RNA sequence: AAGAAC
């Protein structure tokens, strides 16, 4: 057997910013998000205990009509030098 | 190096 997730795959409005260089907030990238369209939610998370933070985020939108270039326009877009991931994550919601 | 919640 085999595996390639660790949650629902069922995605379908949590956009984010995997990978957000762990230099950067929510406070920040609300911002330029708010750029290509309304913003319903934002968020980063990191670990419980230890092993220092995961050190990644979701974003979300209320209307994904417009939510869907924000998407593509910000993907690998500049903010550490590292083309950080921006575009739907999975398991919807938090935990 | 990307990654898992609350």
Request: aromatic share 10%.
């Amino acid at each position: 057997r085999h595996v390639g997730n660790r949650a629902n795959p069922d995605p379908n409005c949590c956009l984010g910013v995997f990978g957000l260089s762990l230099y950067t907030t929510e406070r920040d990238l609300r911002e330029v998000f708010s750029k290509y369209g309304p913003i319903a939610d934002v968020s980063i998370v990191y670990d419980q205990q230890s092993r220092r933070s995961r050190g990644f985020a979701f974003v979300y939108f209320e209307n994904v009509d417009d939510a869907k270039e924000a998407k593509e326009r910000a993907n690998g877009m500049e903010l550490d030098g590292r083309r950080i991931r921006v575009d739907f994550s999975i398991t919807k919601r938090p935990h």
